[PDB]
Amino acid sequence: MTILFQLALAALVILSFVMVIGVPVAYASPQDWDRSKQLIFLGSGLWIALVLVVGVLNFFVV
Amino acid sequence: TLTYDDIVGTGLANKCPTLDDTARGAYPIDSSQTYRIARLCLQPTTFLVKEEPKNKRQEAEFVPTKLVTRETTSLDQIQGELKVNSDGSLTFVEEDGIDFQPVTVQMAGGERIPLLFTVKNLVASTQPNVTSITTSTDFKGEFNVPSYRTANFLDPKGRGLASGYDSAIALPQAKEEELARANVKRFSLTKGQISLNVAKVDGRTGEIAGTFESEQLSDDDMGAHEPHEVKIQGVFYASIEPA
Amino acid sequence: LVNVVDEKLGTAYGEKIDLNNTNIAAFIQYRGLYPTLAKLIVKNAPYESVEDVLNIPGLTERQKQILRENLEHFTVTEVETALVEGGDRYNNGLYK
Amino acid sequence: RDQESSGFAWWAGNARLINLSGKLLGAHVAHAGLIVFWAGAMTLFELAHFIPEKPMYEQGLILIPHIATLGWGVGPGGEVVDTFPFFVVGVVHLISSAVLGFGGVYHAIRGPETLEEYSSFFGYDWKDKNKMTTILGFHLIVLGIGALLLVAKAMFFGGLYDTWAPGGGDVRVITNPTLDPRVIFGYLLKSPFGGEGWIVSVNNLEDVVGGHIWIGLICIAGGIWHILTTPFGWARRAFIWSGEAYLSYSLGALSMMGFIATCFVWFNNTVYPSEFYGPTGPEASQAQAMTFLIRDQKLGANVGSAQGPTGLGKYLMRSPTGEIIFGGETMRFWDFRGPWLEPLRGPNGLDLNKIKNDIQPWQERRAAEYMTHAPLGSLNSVGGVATEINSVNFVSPRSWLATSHFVLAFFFLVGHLWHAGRARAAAAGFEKGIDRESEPVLSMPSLD
Amino acid sequence: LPEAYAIFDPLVDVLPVIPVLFLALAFVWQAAVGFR
Amino acid sequence: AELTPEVLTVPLNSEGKTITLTEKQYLEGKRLFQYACASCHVGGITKTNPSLDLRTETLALATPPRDNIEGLVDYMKNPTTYDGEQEIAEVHPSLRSADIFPKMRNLTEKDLVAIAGHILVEPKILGDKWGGGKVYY
Amino acid sequence: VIAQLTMIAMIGIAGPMIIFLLAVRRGNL
Amino acid sequence: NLWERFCNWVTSTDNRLYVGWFGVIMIPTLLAATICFVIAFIAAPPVDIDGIREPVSGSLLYGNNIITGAVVPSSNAIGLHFYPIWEAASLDEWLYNGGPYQLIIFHFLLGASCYMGRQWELSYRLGMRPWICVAYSAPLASAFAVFLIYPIGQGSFSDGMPLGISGTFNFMIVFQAEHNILMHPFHQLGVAGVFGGALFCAMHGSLVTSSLIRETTETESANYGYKFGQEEETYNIVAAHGYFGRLIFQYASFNNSRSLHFFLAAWPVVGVWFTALGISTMAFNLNGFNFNHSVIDAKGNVINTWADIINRANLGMEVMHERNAHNFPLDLA
Numbered sequence A: 001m002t003i004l005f006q007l008a009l010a011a012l013v014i015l016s017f018v019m020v021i022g023v024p025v026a027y028a029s030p031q032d033w034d035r036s037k038q039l040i041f042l043g044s045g046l047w048i049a050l051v052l053v054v055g056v057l058n059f060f061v062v
Numbered sequence B: 001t002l003t004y005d006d007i008v009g010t011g012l013a014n015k016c017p018t019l020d021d022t023a024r025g026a027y028p029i030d031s032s033q034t035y036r037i038a039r040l041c042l043q044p045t046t047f048l049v050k051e052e053p054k055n056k057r058q059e060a061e062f063v064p065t066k067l068v069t070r071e072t073t074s075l076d077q078i079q080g081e082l083k084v085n086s087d088g089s090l091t092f093v094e095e096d097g098i099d100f101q102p103v104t105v106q107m108a109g110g111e112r113i114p115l116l117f118t119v120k121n122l123v124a125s126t127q128p129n130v131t132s133i134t135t136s137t138d139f140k141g142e143f144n145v146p147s148y149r150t151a152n153f154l155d156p157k158g159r160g161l162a163s164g165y166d167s168a169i170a171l172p173q174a175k176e177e178e179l180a181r182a183n184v185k186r187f188s189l190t191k192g193q194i195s196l197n198v199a200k201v202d203g204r205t206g207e208i209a210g211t212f213e214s215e216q217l218s219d220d221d222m223g224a225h226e227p228h229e230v231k232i233q234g235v236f237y238a239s240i241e242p243a
Numbered sequence C: 001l002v003n004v005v006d007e008k009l010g011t012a013y014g015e016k017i018d019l020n021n022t023n024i025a026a027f028i029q030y031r032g033l034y035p036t037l038a039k040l041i042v043k044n045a046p047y048e049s050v051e052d053v054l055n056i057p058g059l060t061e062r063q064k065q066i067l068r069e070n071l072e073h074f075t076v077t078e079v080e081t082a083l084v085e086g087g088d089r090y091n092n093g094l095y096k
Numbered sequence D: 001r002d003q004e005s006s007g008f009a010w011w012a013g014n015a016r017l018i019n020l021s022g023k024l025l026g027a028h029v030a031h032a033g034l035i036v037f038w039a040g041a042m043t044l045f046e047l048a049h050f051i052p053e054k055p056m057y058e059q060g061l062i063l064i065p066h067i068a069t070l071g072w073g074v075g076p077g078g079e080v081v082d083t084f085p086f087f088v089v090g091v092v093h094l095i096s097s098a099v100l101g102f103g104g105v106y107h108a109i110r111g112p113e114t115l116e117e118y119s120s121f122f123g124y125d126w127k128d129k130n131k132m133t134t135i136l137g138f139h140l141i142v143l144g145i146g147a148l149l150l151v152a153k154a155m156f157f158g159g160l161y162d163t164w165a166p167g168g169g170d171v172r173v174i175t176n177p178t179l180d181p182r183v184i185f186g187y188l189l190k191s192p193f194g195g196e197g198w199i200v201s202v203n204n205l206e207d208v209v210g211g212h213i214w215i216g217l218i219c220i221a222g223g224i225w226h227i228l229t230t231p232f233g234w235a236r237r238a239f240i241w242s243g244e245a246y247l248s249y250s251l252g253a254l255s256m257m258g259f260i261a262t263c264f265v266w267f268n269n270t271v272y273p274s275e276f277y278g279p280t281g282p283e284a285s286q287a288q289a290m291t292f293l294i295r296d297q298k299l300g301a302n303v304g305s306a307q308g309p310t311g312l313g314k315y316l317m318r319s320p321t322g323e324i325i326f327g328g329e330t331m332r333f334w335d336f337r338g339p340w341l342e343p344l345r346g347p348n349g350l351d352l353n354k355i356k357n358d359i360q361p362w363q364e365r366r367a368a369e370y371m372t373h374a375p376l377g378s379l380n381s382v383g384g385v386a387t388e389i390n391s392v393n394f395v396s397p398r399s400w401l402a403t404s405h406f407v408l409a410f411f412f413l414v415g416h417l418w419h420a421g422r423a424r425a426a427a428a429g430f431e432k433g434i435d436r437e438s439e440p441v442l443s444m445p446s447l448d
Numbered sequence E: 001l002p003e004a005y006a007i008f009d010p011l012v013d014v015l016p017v018i019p020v021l022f023l024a025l026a027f028v029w030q031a032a033v034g035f036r
Numbered sequence F: 001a002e003l004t005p006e007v008l009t010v011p012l013n014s015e016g017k018t019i020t021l022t023e024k025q026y027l028e029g030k031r032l033f034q035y036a037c038a039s040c041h042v043g044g045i046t047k048t049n050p051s052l053d054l055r056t057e058t059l060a061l062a063t064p065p066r067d068n069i070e071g072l073v074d075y076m077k078n079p080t081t082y083d084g085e086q087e088i089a090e091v092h093p094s095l096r097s098a099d100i101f102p103k104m105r106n107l108t109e110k111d112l113v114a115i116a117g118h119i120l121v122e123p124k125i126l127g128d129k130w131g132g133g134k135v136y137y
Numbered sequence G: 001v002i003a004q005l006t007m008i009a010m011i012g013i014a015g016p017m018i019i020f021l022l023a024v025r026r027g028n029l
Numbered sequence H: 001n002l003w004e005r006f007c008n009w010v011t012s013t014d015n016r017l018y019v020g021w022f023g024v025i026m027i028p029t030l031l032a033a034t035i036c037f038v039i040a041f042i043a044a045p046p047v048d049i050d051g052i053r054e055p056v057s058g059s060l061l062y063g064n065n066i067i068t069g070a071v072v073p074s075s076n077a078i079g080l081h082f083y084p085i086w087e088a089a090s091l092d093e094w095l096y097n098g099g100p101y102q103l104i105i106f107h108f109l110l111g112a113s114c115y116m117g118r119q120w121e122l123s124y125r126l127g128m129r130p131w132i133c134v135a136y137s138a139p140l141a142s143a144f145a146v147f148l149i150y151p152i153g154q155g156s157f158s159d160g161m162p163l164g165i166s167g168t169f170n171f172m173i174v175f176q177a178e179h180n181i182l183m184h185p186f187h188q189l190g191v192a193g194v195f196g197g198a199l200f201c202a203m204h205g206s207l208v209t210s211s212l213i214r215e216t217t218e219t220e221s222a223n224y225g226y227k228f229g230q231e232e233e234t235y236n237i238v239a240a241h242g243y244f245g246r247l248i249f250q251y252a253s254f255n256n257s258r259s260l261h262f263f264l265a266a267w268p269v270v271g272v273w274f275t276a277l278g279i280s281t282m283a284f285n286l287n288g289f290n291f292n293h294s295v296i297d298a299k300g301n302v303i304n305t306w307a308d309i310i311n312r313a314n315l316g317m318e319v320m321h322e323r324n325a326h327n328f329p330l331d332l333a
């Protein structure tokens, strides 16, 4: 249980750090970005999942 | 009946409890029981200050004054011993309670007269043979009037009794012999006379009430000047219960 | 015109603990006096002599033994009004 | 997005967003994100440094006492029984900041520059009196709902922390909220001076819950009103209708609310429980007089007849209206009311007999505790007066909260003056200086 | 904090300062464009 | 001058036994003092009762004597008045009343010794300053 | 203990890094 | 109608002294405060400020001069209670308990607040820019701090600054003892505000005086070289810039007059703002830095600094101020 909880929590932090830098760069980006609302939609939907996952796996570890 | 929140800010807190006009009864005094005054209250309504007539032959007059310290003048929750002297006369020996209030009154001309309205160490007695306390019972007795300020009080130049300077340090080389009365503080202690006349009695509850008239000296400012003779008039309340 | 407090420092008051005048916080200078015995002494004041403190009603035998051991640290002078009024014996307005 | 085209310098660059609804929307939502972010990050911070057995006001906490007042994670006496509700509040606020932060950035640097021709519903014009009152109405309803959330919390979901609870402070469900307008609006008509204290003097949760019920319905009804209506004639001629003008109106409001909050946390010990925020100024001072009355009475002192250096009672004296109060310099604080002192309060104030016989050890503990935790501290957090030596690391939360929100309130008053003055000048057409060639004064008759 | 979240204790002690960095970030971006 | 083993050598009991605390024992011996004592006992005095200080000479004349480690540890467990006639646990922080004084709950037996030692070491350092008051600030 | 300092490092540089990336990419700054 | 005619005269830009709607409130409140102040400063009987029945003389007729004279603050027994004339049993009582002080500061603060708003008003009636009132908010804030905010935090109007020269000093000395205001950054910013203000005042004054274009002769004042209402400047800003730009270095000097005068306005107003907030925040006992016994040697001995010497001074003020008012070891109010 803890095996999945901390992984999903550590990945949530790492993903966020990518999103924190990635999202504003992708927006202010002239060319190069049909490329990237996929990855915006990628991380976003994946971010919400991890939040719920860690939120659910919280009651099983504490 | 009434709570603190009903009375707060009204001025009723400075007023002594009153008895209804129905209370013209009598309270039996048993010789084999021991009695106490559970609560004594004194509410002054008039401060008369004996002015000082010039210097010739005049009869000293008590002139009216004006209170300037607001409604902070009453003595309350005073308790003590109500003794039954075998002659029948009663005797109240004051023990504890808010038995003092600093009061400042202002005479015509602007002169303010500070005094310590008090009944500390009061021993008031009645007429011989009192089987019951009626609407004719009156208490006569004496009390101690301590100094208005206590020994730790410092004047504007830092002089005092148990503390402070003992000279005028603003005048290093001045002749101290003329400022002796101002440099040397003195703790005063005089007697005061008071008459407690009962006009209302509730024999059931043991509550008595009426008017009083006390005479005492005012502040002498650690002996810096002469005190004024003050006459305080007002109403009182007292509850009597067996020990 | 004499300062009564200064004048009292020229007596035993300035030397030992006056049972009729000295503040109650002075009974801390010696063992087993504060605050139980200290309260009793000041409450049953004044005394004609020092050894009258042994006659306080309700004293246990150990208490009267402690009092005897500190009779040498006690004294009795005339009651000074300026030192007893205002409840100064229980709080004279001095701390640290 | 430069000075030559917008007319504003870089130090006033946010004033370029006046007529750009799109980017301005992103700015406010992003700033909102910053707010919810701090509300969560600080909570997690406070919880991380939190020590259960050690008092809240000794650990420099401001957010946890707020949650605790709502009844979460606390029990009898304000003791912490579960730190988990603190964690949830911190996490939920924090995660939400990412959501507001996402749209805040989107609406700002890639959302439509203007909302007016993306949508007629979201797009607006500052001078459209109908559109503004409508938006005002919507947000009025949102505020009304939030007030009912507090009511729902207090009446349906656990309740609030009642410091006036019988047997000691505890979490209590409010079942009978005060609906009487003579009480609710009675507060609003109270004097702001001593003994009264305006709305700050609210001392029971019943008046609080019942109060938020009133303001809840009022905002909703008012919200519906401004949505269905349009500004009357007398209102159209009185105000300035522009973006900066509306901002100044809100700056004056927040400035006033800032000053009100400053007085609440400093005087009120009901909505700001002393068990969480520490004793108030008046409270601590009254506790010292309480502490030494008890100590001296144990030594055999008659505190009722104890005369002080000035002639006034050393422990007990009278208020100007006659109420029996604590003596000394604390005579100024005789309007203080606290659950640890009221048991000794009678019809005429402090009852000397209750004082002599009925004082309990828990009252003595609380008095000494609040005396030694008076809201007096240096900037570098050294507890006590300025002359105190370094040892105790303490500054009361009340001091931090009162000082911070006074600085903010005053500056926002300056903000009101700045932005309102310019709003007047701009709407009149001389905010950029006097036209050299229609100088109004030169057309005026001389003063002498 | 719960013992499961004791991992991010150093991270928690940093988060509150982040909003202030946004104020400083505005100056970086403005310096980057040369304060237009 | 420096914190020497001769300074950190404090009386242990009522019979002349002695112990020497380490420097670290003294350091957190002060932290714990600032944790649960300094609010009332800052500088060696007593804000809620200035008549009694934490001076060695005062503790010695206390009943029972508190001028040693075991004397102070016993006081932190079961506190009494200056003559020892009454027990004041209900108004003074102790292990006996750790329920109403929650900061006494997690104090180990070892922690009380460090607290007791700090009270004995400080006057050997600050002299009359310890328990002196604002006069010696 | 200096995990302290590692957090403020990545977090603190996260801001300016975006500006640097948008500069070398010549983005909409 | 005669209502708009009244509104026309009130907002008239042709009155010798502009009234305005703010002035409608300003004039009576200032006149009420001034009249009462002048009367009280001369003839008012002693006032029991500390509420300990120890009256303090403040008026001239009762033994004061201009320096020692003061309108003494209201009693501590009153505290923050609103105490108008009709709340006293007599004027004799009203004077004894520091009545006049409350009437003055209340009518004043209101009149002074309207004075600020009045400044905006005339500026709006004249087509000016309106931020003059903003510069006035700094001394106004300072007035609110020592008359209102500090009494609120401390819980008594007796702790408000007395209306007197010596009384002001008394306020300053006691403040330092209990707050260590000197060691507070906001007062330090304030000192930097007024020191810097005086400097920049003398600076801008001397640089413009030095650049005055010769239009007058040896036997007449240079001031007559400027005629009121002229269109051209009376000095050489280029010559001024080249002087000051060489006194230090070029880029440390202002070439823009508008940017120059803004700095002249910004520096003192901001500085006074902080010292105003300083008093306002120290009203809630957030005091200046406490570095007492901060330096310790290896053994544990206290190595004193200048802060420790400052502390010894504060102790002297503390144990002497209001020598009969305190009954308990800690000064909380």
Ligand code: CLA
Pocket (backbone or CB within 6 Å): D010, D011, D012, D013, D014, D015, D247, D251, D411, D412, D413, D414, D415, D416, D418, D419, D422, E020
């Ligand atoms: C709700 C609040 C609010 C809002 C939305 C606005 C909005 C606006 N203001 Mg206004 N203003 C406000 C409050 C507000 N103001 C307040 C309270 C004051 C009084 C202090 C002012 C004073 C003011 C002035 C003087 C001016 C504006 C102007 C403006 C415009 C441009 C702002 C800009 O680009 O700033 C840019 C932002 C900065 C340069 C950053 C300033 C940072 C300050 C100086 C220090 C902050 C320190 C921090 C709190 C603590 C330390 C942090 C760290 C160092 C440790 C814009 C219309 C301008 C205008 O008139 O436009 C038409 C203008 O000249 N405002």
Ligand code: CLA
Pocket (backbone or CB within 6 Å): A016, A019, A020, A021, A023, A024, A028, D001, D002, D009, D010, D011, D012, D013, D014, D015, D016, D017, D020, D023, D024, D026, D027, D028, D030, D031, D098, D099, D101, D102, D105, D108, D109, E023, E026, E027, E029, E030, G018, G019, G022, G028, G029
């Ligand atoms: C509360 C702070 C705040 C906010 C929300 C805004 C918001 C805004 N400002 Mg303003 N500004 C501020 C403070 C703020 N400003 C201050 C303090 C100053 C003084 C230095 C200025 C000076 C200023 C100027 C001079 C201008 C603006 C302009 C703008 C707008 C366009 C910005 C732009 O295109 O940047 C482009 C920048 C980038 C593309 C770089 C990246 C920016 C993003 C937002 C970084 C996000 C980081 C974050 C961690 C991402 C998280 C993502 C996800 C995980 C949630 C925008 C609505 C402009 C305007 O009005 O245009 C019409 C303009 O000219 N501002």
Ligand code: CLA
Pocket (backbone or CB within 6 Å): D038, D045, D046, D049, D059, D060, D061, D062, D379, D381, D397, D400, D401, D404, D405, D407, D411, E016, E017, E020, H270
């Ligand atoms: C409402 C604001 C507020 C308040 C009342 C508090 C109160 C508190 N905080 Mg918190 N804090 C806040 C905001 C606030 N904080 C914010 C916004 C942040 C994010 C940076 C933090 C981050 C933070 C941390 C990290 C910590 C605290 C802690 C504390 C405690 C001690 C504070 C201290 O010692 O400061 C020190 C005092 C100063 C640094 C003085 C700053 C003075 C400023 C610059 C004045 C500015 C005035 C004005 C804006 C100027 C405008 C000028 C312009 C107009 C020209 C205390 C309970 C500590 C604690 O004990 O936590 C448990 C702790 O560790 N806070």
Ligand code: CLA
Pocket (backbone or CB within 6 Å): D025, D029, D099, D100, D102, D103, D104, D106, D107, D111, D112, D115, D118, D119, D122
């Ligand atoms: C202040 C709030 C606010 C407002 C007024 C707008 C307004 C707008 N947004 Mg934006 N947006 C916001 C916040 C806001 N947004 C936030 C926080 C995010 C991040 C999640 C986004 C993300 C976003 C995107 C990605 C897009 C927009 C777009 C739009 C436009 C169309 C919106 C629409 O059709 O909604 C329809 C919505 C509904 C019919 C129902 C919404 C219900 C919400 C989600 C919850 C309601 C419950 C309650 C209010 C929640 C409160 C939460 C909290 C505050 C307590 C419009 C200009 C679009 C645009 O401009 O396209 C060109 C677009 O693509 N927004």
Ligand code: CLA
Pocket (backbone or CB within 6 Å): D133, D136, D140, D188, D189, D218, D219, D220, D221, D222, D223, D225, D226, D229, D230, D231, D232, D235
């Ligand atoms: C956020 C709150 C808010 C805001 C910004 C507005 C804004 C507006 N409302 Mg709305 N309104 C609100 C809430 C709000 N309202 C709510 C909740 C209700 C329901 C009760 C109403 C009911 C309402 C009505 C019935 C009317 C408005 C009207 C107006 C407009 C003119 C307001 C005006 O002239 O005020 C200034 C008010 C005055 C000049 C009158 C004197 C006010 C005195 C001096 C206040 C003294 C306060 C005192 C100092 C402190 C408070 C304590 C105590 C005395 C109460 C304006 C568009 C008017 C309009 O044009 O509607 C189309 C109108 O007739 N509002």
Ligand code: HEC
Pocket (backbone or CB within 6 Å): D368, D369, D372, F033, F036, F037, F038, F039, F040, F041, F046, F048, F049, F052, F053, F054, F058, F059, F062, F066, F072, F075, F076, F080, F081, F082, F088, F091, F092, F093, F115
């Ligand atoms: C940290 C947990 C503490 C230690 C260790 C001690 N105290 Fe206190 N204390 C307080 C008072 C009011 C007194 C005097 C009252 C009385 O004794 O009747 C004391 C006394 C002591 C003593 C006795 C000193 C002597 O006999 O001369 C010791 C050894 C002592 N204390 C140790 C009050 C407070 C207080 C405020 C509620 C706190 C937090 C503490 N004391 C903490 C400690």
Ligand SMILES: CC1=C(/C=C/C(C)=C/C=C/C(C)=C/C=C/C=C(C)/C=C/C=C(C)/C=C/C2=C(C)CCCC2(C)C)C(C)(C)CCC1
Pocket (backbone or CB within 6 Å): A012, A013, A016, A054, D026, D027, D030, D031, D033, D034, D037, D091, D094, D095, D097, D098, D100, D101, D102, D104, D105, D108, E005, E008, E022, E023, E025, E026, E029
């Ligand atoms: C517009 C603009 C601007 C601004 C911007 C902004 C302001 C933004 C914001 C943004 C934001 C506001 C963001 C936010 C974010 C958030 C986040 C991202 C969060 C996260 C969280 C997390 C991740 C959590 C985690 C955890 C968990 C889950 C549990 C507990 C523990 C932990 C912590 C681990 C500027 C000025 C700069 C410039 C340009 C323009």
Ligand SMILES: CC1=C(/C=C/C(C)=C/C=C/C(C)=C/C=C/C=C(C)/C=C/C=C(C)/C=C/C2=C(C)CCCC2(C)C)C(C)(C)CCC1
Pocket (backbone or CB within 6 Å): D183, D184, D185, D187, D188, D199, D202, D207, D208, D209, D210, D211, D212, D214, D215, D238
């Ligand atoms: C919740 C709660 C409560 C209640 C509250 C309430 C109920 C409130 C209300 C409030 C309100 C109800 C308020 C109001 C306000 C108002 C205002 C604030 C106004 C203003 C106005 C103005 C500002 C105007 C101005 C002007 C003039 C003067 C003239 C013309 C021009 C102009 C317009 C500018 C209680 C206390 C119970 C308790 C606590 C809680």
Ligand SMILES: CC1=C(/C=C/C(C)=C/C=C/C(C)=C/C=C/C=C(C)/C=C/C=C(C)/C=C/C2=C(C)CCCC2(C)C)C(C)(C)CCC1
Pocket (backbone or CB within 6 Å): A013, A014, A016, A017, A018, A020, E011, E015, E018, E021, E022, E024, E025, E027, E028, E031, G011, G012, G013, G014, G015, G016
């Ligand atoms: C929640 C969370 C998160 C997020 C975070 C964030 C959102 C952050 C942000 C951050 C940031 C947002 C940062 C920023 C920074 C910035 C800075 C640090 C800046 C600085 C600046 C400066 C330093 C400047 C300087 C200057 C210039 C350049 C101009 C003017 C002059 C001077 C020199 C002043 C993560 C993912 C981690 C995960 C965990 C949780």
Ligand code: OEX
Pocket (backbone or CB within 6 Å): D329, H050, H076, H154, H158, H159, H174, H178, H321, H322, H325, H331, H332, H333
């Ligand atoms: O009144 Mn005027 O000076 Ca304010 O601290 Mn507490 O109270 Mn009294 O002593 Mn310090």
Ligand SMILES: [Cl-]
Pocket (backbone or CB within 6 Å): H170, H174, H320, H321, H322, H323
């Ligand atoms: Cl003084």
Ligand SMILES: [Cl-]
Pocket (backbone or CB within 6 Å): D327, D328, D329, D330, H325, H326, H327, H328
């Ligand atoms: Cl006091």
Ligand SMILES: [Fe+3]
Pocket (backbone or CB within 6 Å): H204, H208, H261
């Ligand atoms: Fe000039």
